[PDB]
Amino acid sequence: EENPSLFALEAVLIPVGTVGLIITLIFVYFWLER
Amino acid sequence: QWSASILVVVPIFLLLTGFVHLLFKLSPRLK
């Protein structure tokens, strides 16, 4: 077993993806504003 | 049995829904 296989599980990629989406939405709102 | 994905995704999903409501409030026919 090379490298941490568990670090490629479902719970790690899903949250970071969602966090990115949220940050994108707030950034979009800021850009549109003014 | 509890799952890390379920417990993490529930609060994150709440935050996402809040954001969708935030945009919807200032966007009627804009998508």
Q: How was this structure determined?
A: NMR
Q: Do A25 and B23 touch (CB under 8 A)?
A: yes
Contacts of B9 in chain A (CB under 8 A): 14-15, 18
Measure the CA–CA gap between B20 and B7, rounded to whole angstroms: 21
Tell whether B8 is within 8 A of chain A (Cβ): yes
Asked if residue A22 lies in contact with residue B19, where contact means CB atoms within 8 angstroms, the answer is yes
Query: Exposed/middle/buried for A14, CB within 10 Å: 0-12, 13-18, 19+?
Result: middle
The secondary structure of A1-34 as a DSSP string is --S-GGGGSHHHHHHHHHHHHHHHHHHHHHHH--
Quickly count: other Cβ atoms within 10 Å of residue A29's Cβ. Answer: 14
Q: What single letter denotes the amino acid at residue A7?
A: F
Q: Do A29 and B22 touch (CB under 8 A)?
A: yes
The one-character DSSP state at B28 is S
Measure the CA–CA gap between B22 and A27, rounded to whole angstroms: 13
